[PDB]
Amino acid sequence: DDPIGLFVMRPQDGEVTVGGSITFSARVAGKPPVVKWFKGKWVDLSSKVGQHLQLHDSYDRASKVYLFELHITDAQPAFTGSYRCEVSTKDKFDCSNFNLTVHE
Amino acid sequence: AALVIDNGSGMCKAGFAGDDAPRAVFPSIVGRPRHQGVMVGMGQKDSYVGDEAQSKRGILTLKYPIEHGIVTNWDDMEKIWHHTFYNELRVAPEEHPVLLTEAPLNPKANREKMTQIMFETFNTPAMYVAIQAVLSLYASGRTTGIVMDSGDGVTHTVPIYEGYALPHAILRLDLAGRDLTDYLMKILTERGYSFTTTAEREIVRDIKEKLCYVALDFEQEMATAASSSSLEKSYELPDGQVITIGNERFRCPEALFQPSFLGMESCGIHETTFNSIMKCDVDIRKDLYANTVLSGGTTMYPGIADRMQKEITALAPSTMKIKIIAPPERKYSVWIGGSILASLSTFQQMWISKQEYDESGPSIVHRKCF
Amino acid sequence: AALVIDNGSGMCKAGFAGDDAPRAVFPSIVGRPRHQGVMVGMGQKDSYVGDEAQSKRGILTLKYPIEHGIVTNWDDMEKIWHHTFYNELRVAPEEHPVLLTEAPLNPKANREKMTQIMFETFNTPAMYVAIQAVLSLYASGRTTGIVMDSGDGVTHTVPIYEGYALPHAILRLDLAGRDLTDYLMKILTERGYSFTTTAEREIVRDIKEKLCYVALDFEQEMATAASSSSLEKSYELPDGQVITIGNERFRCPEALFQPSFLGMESCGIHETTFNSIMKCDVDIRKDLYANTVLSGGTTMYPGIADRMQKEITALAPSTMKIKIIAPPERKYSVWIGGSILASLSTFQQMWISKQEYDESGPSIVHRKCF
Amino acid sequence: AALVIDNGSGMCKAGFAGDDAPRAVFPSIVGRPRHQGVMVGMGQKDSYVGDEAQSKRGILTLKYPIEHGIVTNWDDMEKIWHHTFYNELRVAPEEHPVLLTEAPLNPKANREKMTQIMFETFNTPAMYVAIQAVLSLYASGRTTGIVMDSGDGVTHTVPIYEGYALPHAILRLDLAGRDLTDYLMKILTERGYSFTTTAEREIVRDIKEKLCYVALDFEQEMATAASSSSLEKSYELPDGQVITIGNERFRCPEALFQPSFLGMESCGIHETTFNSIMKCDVDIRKDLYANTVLSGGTTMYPGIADRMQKEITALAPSTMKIKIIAPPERKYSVWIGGSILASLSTFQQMWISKQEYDESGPSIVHRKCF
């Protein structure tokens, strides 16, 4: 298939009930990698951080791997759509796609 | 058409463009239940917004959505806007474009997110972000002058000559009425009265609004305050206690004039205005001095213009007469400028549109406007 | 009637034949908005011409259409001409022939294009290009002599005998009132006052026109300038700021006499007048010295004639007595020569017709007139 | 041969003539206690001068003795000089003549007072006032050329041919490194970071010295600034707070090239250098372009010479190749000229004696030297 990027694990599609919590995560194998999260093709999730959306970054020393997490709580209709995860490397850029759905 | 919202500290003023008075005036405070409880017969009412909060002020812990022209929490602001559009305006956001007024040299993030929420949260065909000094100039009805913009949040200076702005000449000042309120509460403690609560914080501000007046000369009144008789007045509080204030009330507004009491090296409002004029071109300086306009929440007190007039006349050359115009209802002047600004046909073409936002992105705000 | 317009650096003179004082005098400047303006209610007016520019001078970036007697941009000139015929004059180009005045040894393109714009952009049956030295001679009322022409643009000398011309004998001098203004601004900087703006450039020129006067001797007053009591005067700017000058004001006119201050190899006005006379034959020299005529913008200051008379008498042969005539209002004398020149019936036959331009071309200007 | 002092903005460099590195480098700033102290056991040190001020920077209010090449307070300067002769140089002013470096077309009061303080405040048998452009000319080892002298304080251009000078051709530029720092602080505010204090003013300058660099082309990097990644860097303040900048850092140096951001009509450094050359004779123009010399505090950033080379090559005639020499340690090059100038035998005769000042007076400076 396509060339290998910096995502060891690509984000996975998820389903969430009303008032629930949903977490999406991506692993990067190794300056530390920079991660951007998007709604649609050009909408930045980072500018949307607040009560309903949080970003968490962590590092695992043993495997030289960075864990990036997206935290969604008290999800509402407005958040339904397509989300794109972009992670950059020291010399490369990579892209992945996933969907968030919240009904009722 | 335009819906006009003045986002100033403490009060949220909303209305319709072209109108001479805003439809909705309420505090911009959001109150939450500080104390936990278990009672049967309450809907709990976790979030309180508007004047309702003022009534239920003691239990509720007030939080200001906007600090120093910067919004700490975006969804609180949405509640404020939701409250303004439906509770008193009784109109739909869909019906008209919305005009928002923002202070000079404000951070990039505030304009981009504010437009982003307006395009996404409330669907409007177009929106525009305007600067408060320009709007005040239109309320004034004059094509040239120097504008003193001092709202509850931050004091700004923006000189103008026959239109055609001078960005370098625009200076931002860290002095404000809200700051005076903090100075005032700090000054009360030495006397023997202490207020450390947000709810009672407003009360000293209230005292300042009607019991405070501008001294023609600070040093002379302060000197005669030793033997005060007519300088002291009695104020009534919800607290159940009576407060008598003297030289303390007029020295609070003074800090705008004398930043030293606050603890800042920056010069006072009269010196800063002079500095703004010095920055400007020599040819346009002459009508700048006689065209000075005062606006905002803390410019309400009588005698401000009288003290400014002599101080500006003293520091400035005597070759030209110094006239300062400070008409009543100047508090709502910023809002008024917004309503007049949106009214003209040329302006409507200029509004940032939803189609443009989605196609190009948030970065277009700087590109389209100042 | 006829229309006479003076064009060529700093000012545009517009008027009617039959009048010794023109209807419209304004600077030849075009103002554009240097700073973009973000406001509502302005017509924007992206183009200012004339005295309006003078009022809105600080914001506008002034540009001179004419540099060193040469026009950099042709459409700016068209706006100026349009402005003179339509606004102040209130006349139609169709109604009368139009007279234009031009200095000697000026480049071909200025005569050809200027006629071309008059023939094409402003349709007229005929037009003529006249030279300042010949018109001054007619004003004088003498058919033989040598004319020293120094005014706006470039100083020129053109001797004539009984109507016959001597092209070799004609001398061009790179001195002008405008040049003095540049000298003056340059001299002000050493004293600690700096003007680098076109708008304030005029202000020093204004100073020079009434404050500056001609000393009997440059060296003695400059020497006595060490302790200046009455040599210093206070001038009031539109700004309201105060400027005091001393030996500085009288040394400005001096530069025409002493170009070394300007930084140019070429000799002063008295040496150049002498050089022009030397080129001419000895037989005609005798009435050349007694018939010297001074006219132009920079010849305004009193005592110029007295200094020139003594310097010319000293340097020149003592064979003949030296007489110089310099009457008041010499600044507009060149324009006056034009208005009178158009008045004569004989002159009307002589104008360069539109039909002739189209049939033969721009190159016939030299052919028709010397 | 004696002592050389560089009095540029921000830093005061002092040392001994004939040395390739000065003995004392410290800021010119004087710090005073902003707040009244409430402590017992302090000498209450009212005035702090030098690097001591840098250590105690937060409480102290820093005032610059020199503004735009002009000293606002004369006694502060005396403390600076007293500090330089005794604290680091450890020599007596009486022992050797003192050489001070002054920029061209500097105001008259600065030369007369500077000499007056040196003759009266400190005892010295002789002193001389030198011009930076000529000193750099000797340092470079060339008799003919054009010198671009830009110090931390002020930028000047002075062309020279075989020992002869052209005052008209000498132009003073209002651009300086200190100005860039002010532009920079002004630019930071829109991003959400605000600095209005003198103490933290230096911190942005520190950022500029290593973080800032010069782009081959301003417009292309700014265009790619939208998607910044490598453009933004993190700077550490004394406080521990973190500042991140992007296109903001390289645009600041640009204003030298493009003054329009500052808000001034006058053209940038490449246009001004060109203007100086145009004034000069065509014959001497050919080696002026290839002999351009850059010196001073603000010429430090890499790529300045490369950007200047194409811009000068583009605007200037192609009749001769354009060569620019920009050696390392250019900041201290001006100082070097002062030390070398003192060294020549001819120069010592030229020093203005203490005896001559007392008899003839302060006005002899123009008489005695250029």
Q: Which residue of B has its CA nearest to A51?
A: B75
**Does C192 contact chain D (CB < 8 Å)?**
yes
Nearest 5°: phi and psi at B76?
A: -70, -40
A56 labeled binding residue: yes
Residues D114, D80: Cα–Cα separation, whole Å: 13
Which amino acid is located at C33 in the chain?
P
- Residue B289: CB atoms within 10 A of its CB come to 23
- Token pair 């026009």 is found at C71
- Token pair 């004047």 is found at B51
CB B63, CB B45: distance < 8 Å: no
- Beta-strand runs (E) in chain C: 3-6, 11-16, 24-27, 30-33, 48-49, 60-63, 66-67, 70-71, 98-102, 126-131, 145-149, 155-161, 164-165, 171-173, 233-236, 242-245, 292-295, 324-325, 352-353
For B136, B214, B327, the CA distances from B13, given in Å and listed in that order, are 15, 26, 19
CB contact under 8 A, D262 and B168: yes
**In angstroms, what separates the C-alpha of C256 from chain B's closest C-alpha?**
30
Residue D268 DSSP class:
-
- Joined together, the tokens standing for residue D53 give 């001020």
A51 labeled binding residue: no
- Joined together, the tokens standing for residue D367 give 């008489």
- Beta-bridge partner residues of A99: A82
Residues D267, D289: Cα–Cα separation, whole Å: 18
**In angstroms, what separates the C-alpha of B58 from chain D's closest C-alpha?**
34
Residues B23, B21: Cα–Cα separation, whole Å: 7
Residues B6, B11: Cα–Cα separation, whole Å: 8
CB contact under 8 A, B284 and C59: yes
Contacts with D166 from chain C: Cβ below 8 Å: 263
Alpha carbon D191 to its chain centroid, in Å, reads 29
Residues D185, D195: Cα–Cα separation, whole Å: 6
Contacts with B265 from chain D: Cβ below 8 Å: 34, 61, 197-198
Of residues D249, D255, D257, the one with CA closest to residue D191: D249
Q: Do chains A and C touch (3 or more CB pairs under 8 A)?
A: no
**In angstroms, what separates the C-alpha of D178 from chain C's closest C-alpha?**
20
CB C11, CB C205: distance < 8 Å: no
Of residues C35, C34, C175, C42, the one with CA closest to residue C103: C175
Helix (H) or strand (E) holding D367: helix D364-368
Question: Cα torsion at B201, B203, B209, B212 (round to 10°)?
Answer: -90
Please report which residue ranges of B41-98 form alpha helices under DSSP H.
51-55, 74-83
Residues A78, A97: Cα–Cα separation, whole Å: 19
For A38, B255, B263, B264, D44, the CA distances from D36, given in Å and listed in that order, are 54, 18, 11, 13, 9
**Mutation to test the B interface, candidates D190, D244, D251, D258, most B Cβ within 10 Å:** D190
Cβ-Cβ contacts under 8 Å for C82 (sequence gap 6 or more): none
CB contact under 8 A, B361 and A42: yes
Which amino acid is located at D355 in the chain?
Q
Structure resolution, Å: 11.0
CB contact under 8 A, D172 and C189: yes
CB B159, CB B137: distance < 8 Å: no
Helix (H) or strand (E) holding B173: strand B171-173
**In angstroms, what separates the C-alpha of B11 from chain D's closest C-alpha?**
23
Residues B162, C35: Cα–Cα separation, whole Å: 12
Nearest to C196 among D168, D169, D265 (CB): D265
| Distance separating the N- and C-terminal Cα atoms of chain A | 38
Residue count of chain A, please give it: 104
CA Rg, chain B, in Å?
A: 22
- Angle at which helix B74-83 crosses helix B108-120, to 10 degrees, equals 50
The secondary structure of C274-327 as a DSSP string is HHHHHHS-HHHHHHHHHTEEEESGGG-STTHHHHHHHHHHHHS-TTS---EE--
CA Rg, chain D, in Å?
A: 22
CB D272, CB D304: distance < 8 Å: no
Residues D24, D16: Cα–Cα separation, whole Å: 10
Contacts with C198 from chain D: Cβ below 8 Å: 265
Residue D10 DSSP class:
S
**Mutation to test the B interface, candidates A36, A51, A54, A79, most B Cβ within 10 Å:** A51
- Joined together, the tokens standing for residue C84 give 């003179």
Find chains touching chain C: ≥3 CB pairs under 8 Å. B, D
**In angstroms, what separates the C-alpha of D43 from chain B's closest C-alpha?**
23
CB A81, CB A39: distance < 8 Å: yes
For A73, B113, B330, C265, D356, the CA distances from B129, given in Å and listed in that order, are 32, 12, 21, 60, 67
Q: Which residue of D has its CA nearest to B170?
A: D186
Contacts with B109 from chain D: Cβ below 8 Å: 192
Residues C153, B15: Cα–Cα separation, whole Å: 61
**In angstroms, what separates the C-alpha of B4 from chain C's closest C-alpha?**
16
CB C290, CB C320: distance < 8 Å: yes
Residue C222 buriedness (CB in 10 A; 0-12 / 13-18 / 19+): middle
CB contact under 8 A, B286 and C35: no
Contacts with A47 from chain B: Cβ below 8 Å: 112-113, 116, 362
Question: Cα torsion at C244, C245, C246, C251 (round to 10°)?
Answer: 180
CB contact under 8 A, B363 and D226: yes
Cβ-Cβ contacts under 8 Å for D225 (sequence gap 6 or more): D231, D246, D247
| Distance separating the N- and C-terminal Cα atoms of chain B | 21
CB D13, CB D332: distance < 8 Å: yes
- Residue C19: CB atoms within 10 A of its CB come to 12
Find chains touching chain B: ≥3 CB pairs under 8 Å. A, C, D
Nearest to D105 among C61, C190, C263 (CB): C190
CB C166, CB C285: distance < 8 Å: no
- Residue D62: CB atoms within 10 A of its CB come to 21
- Angle at which helix D108-120 crosses helix D74-83, to 10 degrees, equals 50
CB contact under 8 A, B319 and C240: yes
Contacts with B365 from chain D: Cβ below 8 Å: none
Using DSSP, state whether A56 is helix, strand or coil.
strand
Nearest to D266 among C34, C190, C196 (CB): C196
A15 labeled binding residue: no
Of residues C24, C63, C11, the one with CA closest to residue C297: C11
Of residues D330, D297, D331, D339, the one with CA closest to residue D99: D339
Using DSSP, state whether D228 is helix, strand or coil.
coil
**In angstroms, what separates the C-alpha of C262 from chain D's closest C-alpha?**
7
Helix (H) or strand (E) holding C162: none
Residues B314, B176: Cα–Cα separation, whole Å: 24
Residues C85, C96: Cα–Cα separation, whole Å: 11
CA Rg, chain C, in Å?
A: 22
Between vectors from CA C41 to CA C30 and to CA B305, what angle results, nearest 5°? 100
Cβ-Cβ contacts under 8 Å for D37 (sequence gap 6 or more): D44
Question: Cα torsion at A43, A47, A52, A56 (round to 10°)?
Answer: 100
Residues B128, B342: Cα–Cα separation, whole Å: 9
Question: Cα torsion at D49, D54, D59, D64 (round to 10°)?
Answer: 50
